Every structure is written in C-alpha cells, then in structure tokens.
C-alpha cells in the first residue's frame, strides 16, 4: 500500500 | 568470459520439451547455460517470472565459515551483513549448473540495529578485493542477517520469512539488484558485453523449525533494470510489496480465483515476481581453503563486541600455534587482511609470495616467507607483548 521510504545503502526490517 | 563459462560452453548437458522434469529434485529455474541451449534446438513492458538462474547453488565451504559470521548477531542481537568471497564452479547435480563456493565472509563497516542495517562506505573495499583476487577469490555475493529471538529458553528464532509473508523485502530486492548491476556477468548475446549478474543474496533467518537456516536468492534481470534506472520503490507499511514510479509503465501477470491470466498496475508490485530462488548447501565433504583454528584470529570490524584485531591478539594467536604448521596458522582470510592493512607494520609490500603460498597450499613456500625480514620484525613486535 503506501510507498515512499527509501535511500539506498540502508535496509529496514518491518516487524509488525 | 569467466573460467566456468568458457568450460560450460564446451560440455554436453543431456543424459527440449520434458527436460525440466527429469534431472530432479524439483528445480524452480533452468540454469543460465541450459536455457541458452534450450533455445538452440533489456533497458528502460511487463513483469514475468524468470525461467532461468545465473547461479543454481550457493555452497558454504564448511559450517564454520557461516557459524563465525553469525556470532556477531548472537553476541549483540543486531543485524549484520558481509560479503561472500569465493569462486564459481560447476554444480554437478544439475547439467550446466553454476555453483557459488563461499570460502570466506568479509564483514565491512556497517551499522546494525535490531531492525535495521546501514551499509557504510568501506575505505578498504578496493584493497580487500586485491588481496582476495590473489587468493583465487572474488565477491560472489552478499549475506545479511534477520534473526529475532522467539523462545529464550529453547534458544530459537522467529520463522518470520515464509510463505504467508515474504522471503525478500522489496528493500532487499532493490539492494540485491543494485549489487547485481555493479557486478555484471559477461556474455556475448547482450547489447553491452554483459548479460545478468552472478552476485547472490544469502539470508540468515529462522526456518520452520525455529532454528537458523540459510537461503539463497538472486533478483530477476528485469528487476535489475527497474532499479538501474531507479524506477522501483519499496513500501513503508508492507515488506512484500514493491512499487513502480512515474518515466515508464510496467506491471505483472497474476491469476485470480477462477484461474485465468491477468494484468494489473504495479501499485504495488508483489515481490514474488522479482525473486529468483537459489538453493543453499553445506557439503558433506567439507572444503578448507582457509584453516580452521580451535581459537581463531579475530574477524575484522568487531569493535562493538570487544573483538579487536591488533598486535595483542596476533601475539596471542601466534603463541597458541607455535606447534602448528605455519601454513595452517597463516591460511586465514581475516588474519591476512589485518597483516596487509594494519597501521603499525603493514605488509602490503611483500605479501604476494605468502598469498600465493596460501592460495596453492604450499608449505615449503610459506616456510621460506616465515624467514622473511618483515615477518621476523613482526615476531620481534609480538614478543614484546606481555
């Protein structure tokens, strides 16, 4: 569903 | 072309319609050469699941290479990542199959959080490839970690990456493809000199038994393109969904609930369409490019948990191995980077001979290097540690 959250070189692990 | 490719072009791969279902276990994707031969008798349409694989098997040389990588997460609970250094060989279970052997995992500068990972710039990136090339090695891929405890009495971990969720986040798909773009694979039938990538993605997470398992992925050659021209975004709420931006127009082909072909705007893009499954192996006849000490020299960049490469740990390490064969003592990728790039007595000037002795497992050659002048003063330095 919603998208924008990115800059390369940085991974986030979405938990919930 | 790579050494393996010059060889796979010269080898028969039989025993074009029922090919996919004989050399079983159930294979998910044809090997790159076989799909090539199954056709002899890419910049910014639509997203179809890729039927071929550049790499068919990722193989760790022994359990220890993977175990020691994982101690970072055990000791800290922070996610960690590394680069897979090794070589490409034939996967003899699959005709014309490409194998990625992992001889060492290199842990570069990074910031690991419980739920996050940042890839800092590595001031040694270049020189490490230089050392690795001379050891017969190259980057074959990258590995990252996504372990979260579940039962702190059992010592188990969440099975969070599964059929009902995702195997690779969209953020990791974009990262994977980026890596594939910067590590292109060399072939003739492509309007650039290169088609695809042999750069693999390893994932350490909980499996269905809530133990740690290792899984292997590459990302599709389409997916390569959408990130190369920055047309693909991840999604803030859901890890299983990508997103195509607005510049060109793409989408995918699902199948609905009475079973016919369909086509819908990639808003989002289910990650399953971008993901290429590679199988992951620990071999029954283990392989020891590098030596296994009972008390190894420390892995690099382990500040945050009090493992440090310095002349104190090398003094300790060297003194525990006085009776060991010198070649076994020194045949350690992490020792070697330190020996070459430390800021006290670096050995970048006279390394070549030793690295050749490690790469060919040559004892007499390593023994003469132990009589080098620069090793004698290395030993003079260690002996002043108390």
């Amino acid at each position: 569903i919603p998208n924008y959250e990115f800059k390369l070189g940085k991974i986030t692990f979405i938990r919930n | 072309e790579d050494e393996i490719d010059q060889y796979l072009s010269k080898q028969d791969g039989k025993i074009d319609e029922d090919y996919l279902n004989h050399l079983e276990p159930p294979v998910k994707h044809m090997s790159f050469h076989a799909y090539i031969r199954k056709l002899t008798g890419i910049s910014c349409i639509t997203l179809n699941r890729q039927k071929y694989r550049h790499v068919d098997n990722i193989m760790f040389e022994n359990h220890t290479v993977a175990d020691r990588f994982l101690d970072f997460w055990r000791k800290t609970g922070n996610q960690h990542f590394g680069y897979l250094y090794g070589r490409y060989t034939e996967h003899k279970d699959i005709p014309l199959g490409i194998r990625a052997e992992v001889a060492a995992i290199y842990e570069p500068p990074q910031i690991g959080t419980q739920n996050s990972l940042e890839l800092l710039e590595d001031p040694k990136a270049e020189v490490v490839d230089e050392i690795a090339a001379k050891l017969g090695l190259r980057k074959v891929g990258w590995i990252f970690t996504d372990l979260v405890s579940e039962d702190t009495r059992k010592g188990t971990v969440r099975y969070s990456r599964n059929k009902d969720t995702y195997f690779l986040s969209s953020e990791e798909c974009i990262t994977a493809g980026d890596f594939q773009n910067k590590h292109p694979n060399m072939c003739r039938l492509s309007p650039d000199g290169h088609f695809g990538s042999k750069f693999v993605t390893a994932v350490a997470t909980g499996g269905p038994d809530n133990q740690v398992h290792f899984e292997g992925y590459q990302v599709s050659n389409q997916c390569m393109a959408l990130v190369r021209d920055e047309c693909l975004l991840p999604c803030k709420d859901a890890p299983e969904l990508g997103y195509a931006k607005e510049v060109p127009d793409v989408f995918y082909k699902d199948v609905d609930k009475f079973g016919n072909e369909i086509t819908q705007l990639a808003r989002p893009l289910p990650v399953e369409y971008l993901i290429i499954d590679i199988t992951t192996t620990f071999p029954k006849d283990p392989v020891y490019t590098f030596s296994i000490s009972q008390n190894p020299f420390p892995i690099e960049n382990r500040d945050v948990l009090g493992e440090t490469q310095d002349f104190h740990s090398l003094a300790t390490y060297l003194s525990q191995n006085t009776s060991s064969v010198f070649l076994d003592t020194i045949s350690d990728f992490h020792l070697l980077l330190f020996l070459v790039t430390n800021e006290v007595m670096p050995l970048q000037d006279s390394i070549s001979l030793l690295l050749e002795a490690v790469r060919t497992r040559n004892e007499e050659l390593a023994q003469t290097w132990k009589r080098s002048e620069q090793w004698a003063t290395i030993e003079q330095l260690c002996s002043t540690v108390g």
Side-chain angles (χ1 to χ4, degrees), chain B residues 46-47 49 251-257 259-264 270 272-273:
Chain B
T46 188
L47 282 180
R49 286 171 220 221
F251 26 71
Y252 58 97
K253 314 184 98 77
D254 201 3
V255 152
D256 48 354
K257 282 164 268 171
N260 284 357
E261 187 181 280
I262 204 46
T263 292
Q264 191 171 201
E272 55 192 274
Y273 298 95

Side-chain angles (χ1 to χ4, degrees), chain B residues 229-258:
Chain B
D229 300 303
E230 326 179 286
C231 321
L232 178 59
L233 259 45
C235 287
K236 150 206 284 300
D237 53 335
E240 70 271 357
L241 303 177
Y243 195 112
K245 218 50 174 158
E246 315 95 304
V247 314
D249 277 74
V250 305
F251 26 71
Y252 58 97
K253 314 184 98 77
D254 201 3
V255 152
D256 48 354
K257 282 164 268 171
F258 29 69

Side-chain angles (χ1 to χ4, degrees), chain B residues 130-173:
Chain B
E130 260 149 40
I131 294 156
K134 219 169 282 181
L135 295 174
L137 306 182
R138 65 197 279 206
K139 285 199 202 53
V140 302
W142 71 308
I143 178 172
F144 72 89
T145 250
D146 177 13
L147 298 153
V148 170
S149 267
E150 177 156 273
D151 183 335
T152 49
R153 163 182 247 103
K154 289 312 170 91
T156 64
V157 277
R158 285 213 239 116
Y159 184 34
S160 74
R161 270 163 205 266
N162 72 68
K163 77 193 183 228
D164 302 337
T165 68
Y166 58 98
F167 297 129
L168 264 187
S169 80
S170 54
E171 283 200 19
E172 304 149 20
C173 287

Side-chain angles (χ1 to χ4, degrees), chain B residues 52-67:
Chain B
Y52 64 104
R53 270 177 334 197
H54 289 284
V55 179
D56 306 285
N57 177 238
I58 302 169
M59 165 195 116
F60 299 85
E61 282 202 357
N62 57 64
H63 268 105
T64 302
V65 177
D67 257 335

